Design a protein around this ligand. Structure first.
Ligand SMILES: Nc1ncnc2c1ncn2[C@@H]1O[C@H](COP(=O)(O)OP(=O)(O)OP(=O)(O)O)[C@@H](O)[C@H]1O
Ligand SMILES: Nc1ncnc2c1ncn2[C@@H]1O[C@H](COP(=O)(O)OP(=O)(O)O)[C@@H](O)[C@H]1O
Ligand SMILES: [Mg+2]
Ligand SMILES: [Mg+2]
Lengths: 140, 47, 48, 250, 384
C-alpha cells in the first residue's frame, strides 16, 4: 500500500537530514552493540540537523511477549528500553521526526503507543474504485 | 492519588514491567513487596 | 551507611571498598516511567 | 445417535434440574408486567419494550390477551412461545363453555394450562417454555381473582405482582404500600404509576411506552376496558404534581 | 548450649541440688582445667591468631561459586559464576556437611579452591505465600454455626494442642479437610479464625493462581510449594477456590485442559505420595463442589467433608448483633424487619448493608445510623 514508497517520496523531496535504518539490524551477536547502536543514531540525529529517523519492520523489535530465559530475548528487551528512554530524552526544541512503518499493529506493545512518544497513527486502507482508477491512470 | 499523595501504580500484565517485579513472578502477589514499601499506595486496573 | 540495593565504587587489585555510588532507581520509578500515565488534577475535571 | 441427546429431562446431582431454572433465568429479562387490585376491577400494567419510531401500533394490545369474555392475561417471556399458549388455553375455555355451557372458573383454567406446561418439564425430551404470565378474571364464586404462572408449571394466588426486570425490587415496595380491600381502582392506579415510575429505569414515563388494561364487573358485561393513550399522561402528571409538593413539603 | 535436658523436678528437690552441683563439678574441676592453656604454651592467642591464620589463608576477593557434585577426598567440581567449572580442592575449615548440589559456596580468587559456604537468602516466594501475623478476631466473631467449629478444631486444633487423646486411643488424625457451600457463607472467614488460633506455620494459596503460562511451571510450582510446606515443621496449607482451575479457561496457558490435567496429576500425587509426608495439614474450600475430580475427594486424600448451609433467621439476628456491636445504633431500627428482607441472604449481605448504612450516615456527618439508612441501604446493596 505504498508504505515504503511514501517514505521514498518524502525522502526524495525532503530538505532536512534523512536517516534510514533497518529495524532488524539492532540484534547484534555481541552485547552492547545493540544499545550503543540505538543511542548513536539519535545522537547523530541530534548533532546533525533537524533530522528524520525512519524505522521499518518494528515487529522485529517491539513485540508483546518476553522471556528472561534465553538472552536473545533479554537483548531485545534491552533494545526496547534504550529507545523507550531516548524518545523521552527530547524537549520539543529539536525537530527530529520519527517515522515508523509496520505491517501488523497486533504484535506491538501499547507502552510504545503512549502519548509523548506515539500519537499519530496512519492506517493504509485499500482503495475501492475512486482512488483505484487514479493508480490506473498513473501506471498506464 | 495525585491529590492524596499515593503511589498510583496501575498493572497491565505486560512483560517489560516484569523485570522490575521479579525474574518469573509466579504469582501477582510479588508486587506487594513494592506496594508495602510505598505503603500509602493505590493500584489501578484497566478492563 | 551501607544500604542494601546500592551501588559502590570498588578497587580492582584487592577488591577493597572505595566509595558509595549515589543512587540508581527505584524498581517502581522506572516502572511508571515506562508506563507514562497522563498526570491529572481537579482543575481538568469536566463536570463529574 | 444418543451422543447428540442433551437429556433435558434428568435431575442434577444436587437434586434440582437446570433447564427450567435457565428458563426462569431468562424470564427475568425482556419484559415488565404487574397486576394489582383491592376492589371492583383489576389492573394490569405492562411496560413496552419496542419503542422504535416506526411501528403501526395496532392489534389492540401488546402483551394483553383477552381469553374468555370475562377474563384476560398479561404475558411475559418469549412472545413466539406465548402465541401457542394464548390460543391454546383459549379453546380450553371454549371447550369448557361447549362442555357445560358456562363461563370457566379462572383458577381451574390456570391449573389446566399449568399441567400442559408441566408435562414438557416432566418427560418427552422437550425444550420447555420460558413464559410466565399473570391472570385476571371474574367469577360468580369469588369475584375478581389474580393468578401467576411460572415456567416450572406451578401457579399461585396473588393480588399484586410484578415479574419485571426489577421484580423483587417492585415487590419490596408493593409490601411497603397497599391496603387490604380498600385500594380502589384509582388509588391502585396512582400507586401503579408510582411502581412503574420506580422500576422504569427510563425516566419521565413515556405514555406510549406502557400498557395498562382494567377489568371491571358490569352487571352482565365484565367490561375489560383497554385505556387509550389520552388518559395515561394526565395520570402521569397527576403523579408529578403530588410528588413535587410531597417532596417540597418535606 | 544443649548441655543437659533434665529440667523436670519443679520443686526444692535434692536431685536438683546435687545435679546442679555436679554441673558445678564438671565446671569447677574443669575450670581448673581451663586455667593452664596460655600459662604453659602461649605461642599465639588462639582467639584471633589462628582465626586470622584462616583469614590470611582466604583472600579478600571471595568469589561466590555453586556446587554440583561432591568427591569425598576434599576436592569437587564446582561451578563458576561464568559457567566454566573447575576441579578445585576443598579446605578444612569448610565443615564438610552444609554441602549439597546447588549450594552457594565461597571460592578462592587464585586457585578457586573451596574456602567457605554461604547462607542462602532463600527466595521471595516463601515470604509471598507465607502469612506473617494473625489476621483477625477469634471464633467468637463467627456465631451461629457452632457445629463444624468442633469439626475444624477436631481435625486441626486438637491434634496440635492435645497429642494425648489419639495415643490413648491408638489412632491418627484425619488428613484432608474440605469446605463447601454457597458463596459468601464464611468459608474463608473460618480459616481467618483458624489462622488466629494456630501456632503452626500457615500458608494460603488461591486455586486461580495455580495456573501458569509456561509448560510444567504449574506442577513445578506444586513441587516447590509442598517442598516449602514440608521444609519448615508443623504446617497448615490452605487452598481457596479450587474449582477455578477447572471452570475458567484462559488464553495465557499455552497448554489446554490437558495441562491443567497434568497439574491435577501432580497435585494428586502431592496429596497422597508414597513419600513420608510429615506434619502438613490441608484445608480446602470451594463453592462448586460438584465440578472437580472425585479422585481428589476420596477418603485418604480428603477425609472430612464439611458443608455450610445458608444461615437460618435466628442465626441471622445473631450475625446482625455481631456486625452491629461497636456501632452507635440509634433505636429507630428494628432488626427483625431487616431479617426477612431477603429470604436467602448471606452473612456478607448483612455486613455490606451495615457498612453501606454507615456510609450513608457519613454522607450526612451524623454519629448514629437511622432506619431510612437501612431502608435505602437494602435498595443499594440488594436491588440493582
Ligand atoms: N456465618 C457468618 N457470620 C458472620 N459473618 C459472616 C458469616 N459468613 C460470612 N460472613 C462474612 O462475609 C464475608 C465473606 O465470607 P467468606 O469469605 O467466608 O465467604 P466464602 O464462602 O469463603 O466465599 P468464597 O469461598 O467463594 O471466597 C466475611 O468477611 C465474613 O465477615
Ligand atoms: N471532565 C473532563 N475534563 C477534561 N477532560 C476530560 C474530562 N473527561 C475526560 N476528559 C478527556 O479524556 C481523557 C481521559 O480519558 P479517561 O476516560 O480518563 O481514560 P479512559 O478512556 O481510559 O477511561 C483526557 O485526556 C481528557 O482530555
Ligand atoms: Mg514495505
Ligand atoms: Mg470467601
Amino acid at each position: 500500500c505504498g508504505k515504503t514508497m511514501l517514505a521514498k517520496a518524502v525522502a526524495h523531496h525532503t530538505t532536512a537530514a534523512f536517516i534510514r535504518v533497518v529495524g532488524s539490524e539492532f540484534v547484534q551477536k555481541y552485547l552492547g552493540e545493540g544499545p550503543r547502536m540505538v543511542r548513536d543514531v539519535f545522537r547523530l540525529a541530534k548533532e546533525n540537523a533537524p533530522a528524520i529517523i525512519f524505522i521499518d519492520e518494528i515487529d522485529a523489535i517491539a513485540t508483546k511477549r518476553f522471556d528472561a530465559q534465553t538472552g536473545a530475548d533479554r537483548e531485545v528487551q534491552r533494545i526496547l528500553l534504550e529507545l523507550l528512554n531516548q524518545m523521552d530524552g527530547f524537549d520539543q526544541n529539536v525537530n527530529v521526526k520519527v517515522i515508523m512503518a509496520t505491517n501488523r499493529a497486533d504484535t506491538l506493545d501499547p507502552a510504545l503507543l503512549r502519548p509523548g512518544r506515539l500519537d499519530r497513527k496512519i492506517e493504509f486502507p485499500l482503495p475501492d474504485r475512486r482512488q483505484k482508477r487514479l493508480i490506473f491512470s498513473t501506471i498506464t | 492519588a495525585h491529590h492524596t499523595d499515593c503511589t498510583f501504580i496501575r498493572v497491565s500484565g505486560s512483560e517489560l514491567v516484569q523485570k522490575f517485579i521479579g525474574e518469573g513472578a509466579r504469582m501477582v502477589r510479588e508486587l506487594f513487596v513494592m506496594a508495602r514499601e510505598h505503603a500509602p499506595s493505590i493500584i489501578f486496573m484497566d478492563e | 551507611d551501607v544500604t542494601p540495593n546500592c551501588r559502590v565504587a570498588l578497587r580492582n587489585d584487592s577488591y577493597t571498598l572505595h566509595k558509595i555510588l549515589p543512587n540508581k532507581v527505584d524498581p517502581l520509578v522506572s516502572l511508571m516511567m515506562v508506563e507514562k500515565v497522563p498526570d491529572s488534577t481537579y482543575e481538568m475535571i469536566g463536570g463529574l | 445417535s444418543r451422543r447428540y441427546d442433551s437429556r433435558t429431562t434428568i435431575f442434577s446431582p444436587e437434586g434440582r434440574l437446570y433447564q427450567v431454572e435457565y428458563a426462569m433465568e431468562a424470564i427475568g429479562h425482556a419484559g415488565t408486567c404487574l397486576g394489582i387490585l383491592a376492589n371492583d376491577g383489576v389492573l394490569l400494567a405492562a411496560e413496552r419494550r419496542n419503542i422504535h419510531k416506526l411501528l403501526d401500533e395496532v392489534f389492540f394490545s401488546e402483551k394483553i390477551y383477552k381469553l374468555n369474555e370475562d377474563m384476560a392475561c398479561s404475558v411475559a417471556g418469549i412472545t413466539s412461545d406465548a402465541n401457542v399458549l394464548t390460543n391454546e388455553l383459549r379453546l380450553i375455555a371454549q371447550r369448557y363453555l361447549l362442555q357445560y355451557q358456562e363461563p370457566i372458573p379462572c383458577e381451574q383454567l390456570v391449573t389446566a394450562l399449568c399441567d400442559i406446561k408441566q408435562a414438557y418439564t416432566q418427560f418427552g425430551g422437550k425444550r420447555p417454555f420460558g413464559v410466565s404470565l399473570l391472570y385476571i378474571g371474574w367469577d360468580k364464586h369469588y369475584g375478581f381473582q389474580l393468578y401467576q404462572s411460572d415456567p416450572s408449571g406451578n401457579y399461585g394466588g396473588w393480588k399484586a405482582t410484578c415479574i419485571g426486570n426489577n421484580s423483587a425490587a417492585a415487590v419490596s415496595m408493593l409490601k411497603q404500600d397497599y391496603k387490604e380491600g380498600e385500594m380502589t381502582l384509582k388509588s391502585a392506579l396512582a400507586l401503579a404509576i408510582k411502581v412503574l415510575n420506580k422500576t422504569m429505569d427510563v425516566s419521565k414515563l413515556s405514555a406510549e411506552k406502557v400498557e395498562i388494561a382494567t377489568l371491571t364487573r358490569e352487571n352482565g358485561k365484565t367490561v375489560i376496558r383497554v385505556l387509550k393513550q389520552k388518559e395515561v399522561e394526565q395520570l402521569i402528571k397527576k403523579h408529578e404534581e403530588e410528588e413535587a409538593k410531597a417532596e417540597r413539603e418535606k | 548450649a544443649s548441655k543437659l535436658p533434665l529440667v523436670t523436678p519443679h520443686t526444692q528437690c535434692r536431685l536438683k541440688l546435687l545435679k546442679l552441683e555436679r554441673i558445678k563439678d564438671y565446671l569447677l574441676m574443669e575450670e581448673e582445667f581451663i586455667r593452664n592453656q596460655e600459662q604453659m604454651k602461649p605461642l599465639e592467642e588462639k582467639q584471633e591468631e589462628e582465626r586470622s591464620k584462616v583469614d590470611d589463608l582466604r583472600g579478600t576477593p571471595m568469589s561466590v561459586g555453586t556446587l554440583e557434585e561432591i568427591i569425598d577426598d576434599n576436592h569437587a567440581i564446582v561451578s563458576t559464576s561464568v559457567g566454566s567449572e573447575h576441579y578445585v580442592s576443598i579446605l578444612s575449615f569448610v565443615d564438610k556437611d552444609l554441602l549439597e548440589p546447588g549450594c552457594s559456596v565461597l571460592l578462592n580468587h587464585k586457585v578457586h579452591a573451596v574456602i567457605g559456604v554461604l547462607m542462602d537468602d532463600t527466595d521471595p516466594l516463601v515470604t509471598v505465600m507465607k502469612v506473617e501475623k494473625a489476621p483477625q478476631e477469634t471464633y467468637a466473631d463467627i456465631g451461629g454455626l457452632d457445629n463444624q467449629i468442633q469439626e475444624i478444631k477436631e481435625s486441626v486444633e486438637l491434634p496440635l494442642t492435645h497429642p494425648e487423646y489419639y495415643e490413648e486411643m491408638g489412632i491418627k488424625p484425619p488428613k484432608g479437610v474440605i469446605l463447601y457451600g454457597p458463596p459468601g457463607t464464611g468459608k474463608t472467614l473460618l480459616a481467618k479464625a483458624v489462622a488466629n488460633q494456630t501456632s503452626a506455620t500457615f500458608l494460603r494459596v488461591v486455586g486461580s493462581e495455580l495456573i501458569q503460562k509456561y509448560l510444567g511451571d504449574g506442577p513445578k510450582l506444586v513441587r516447590e510449594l509442598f517442598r516449602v510446606a514440608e521444609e519448615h515443621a508443623p504446617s497448615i496449607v490452605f487452598i481457596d477456590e479450587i474449582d477455578a482451575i477447572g471452570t475458567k479457561r484462559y488464553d495465557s496457558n499455552s497448554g489446554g485442559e490437558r495441562e491443567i490435567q497434568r497439574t491435577m496429576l501432580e497435585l494428586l500425587n502431592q496429596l497422597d505420595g508414597f513419600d513420608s509426608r510429615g506434619d502438613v495439614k490441608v484445608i480446602m474450600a470451594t463453592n462448586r463442589i460438584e465440578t472437580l475430580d472425585p479422585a481428589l475427594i476420596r477418603p485418604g486424600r480428603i477425609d472430612r467433608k464439611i458443608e455450610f448451609p445458608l444461615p437460618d433467621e435466628k442465626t441471622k439476628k445473631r450475625i446482625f448483633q455481631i456486625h452491629t456491636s461497636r456501632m452507635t445504633l440509634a433505636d429507630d431500627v428494628t432488626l427483625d424487619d431487616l431479617i426477612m428482607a431477603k429470604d436467602d441472604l448471606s452473612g456478607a449481605d448483612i455486613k455490606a448493608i451495615c457498612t453501606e448504612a454507615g456510609l450513608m450516615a457519613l454522607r450526612e456527618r451524623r454519629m448514629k445510623v437511622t432506619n431510612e439508612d437501612f431502608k435505602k441501604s437494602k435498595e443499594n446493596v440488594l436491588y440493582k
